[PDB]
Every structure is written in C-alpha cells, then in structure tokens.
Design a protein around this ligand. Structure first.
Ligand SMILES: *[C@@H]1O[C@H](CO)[C@@H](O)[C@H](O)[C@H]1NC(C)=O
Lengths: 50, 48
C-alpha cells in the first residue's frame, strides 16, 4: 500500500481483526503497522493555494 | 478463502432465537482453496 501523509498517534479503538481504515474517497486514513502492531493515523500533508 | 465469522452472546431465552442485534466479528480467514457444497454438524453423545 503506497501513499503520502503524516503518520500520527491516534485514539481510534480498532478491533483486533481491523487493520486499516478508509475515508469517503476509499484512501487509507489509518493503518496498523506490521512487526509492532501499533495503529498509526494517516493525515494528508498540508496543501493549498498560493 | 473460507471465512469463519463468530459471535458469543449471553442470552436467557428458553426456546427460540432472541430478538436483538449482535454483529459477528470475523474469527478465522482460512486458506483452503477447495470446493465445498455440503456440510454436516457434529454433536456429542452422553453415556451413562
Ligand atoms: C464443486 O462441486 C459441485 C458438486 O460436486 C460441482 O457441481 C461443481 O462443478 C464443482 N466446482 C468445481 C470448481 O470443482
């Protein structure tokens, strides 16, 4: 799974089966990292109009 | 892929199914790759 974003701590109580999370666009918004099983929230990097 | 979803619920109804809502969590995702068309459940006898 490829993508760009800022990985931050999260307070979303994922259930054991649950691995990732999806937004309306179906792009991944949270993910469970292998090896350490922690849940990292994925927030798209800041952008806007110059 | 043979998916087993399971849920355990504490109930107190005597005869029929209880009326309510309980979502079944996925338990086992099993990589078998075989054809399944017929099943049979297993019971346990009591001997005295
Ligand atoms: C699976 O088994 C059924 C009944 O034996 C048969 O009709 C069907 O063609 C089989 N499918 C495959 C992919 O073997």
């Amino acid at each position: 799974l490829t993508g760009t974003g800022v990985l931050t701590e999260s307070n979303k109580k994922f259930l054991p089966f649950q691995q990732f999370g999806r937004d309306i666009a179906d792009t991944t918004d949270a993910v469970r990292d292998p090896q350490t099983l922690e849940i990292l929230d994925i927030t798209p990097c800041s952008f806007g109009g110059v | 892929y043979f998916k087993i979803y399971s849920k355990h619920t504490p109930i107190n109804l005597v005869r029929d199914l209880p009326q309510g809502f309980s979502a079944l969590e996925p338990l086992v995702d099993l990589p078998i790759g075989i054809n399944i068309t017929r099943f049979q459940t297993l019971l346990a006898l009591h001997r005295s």
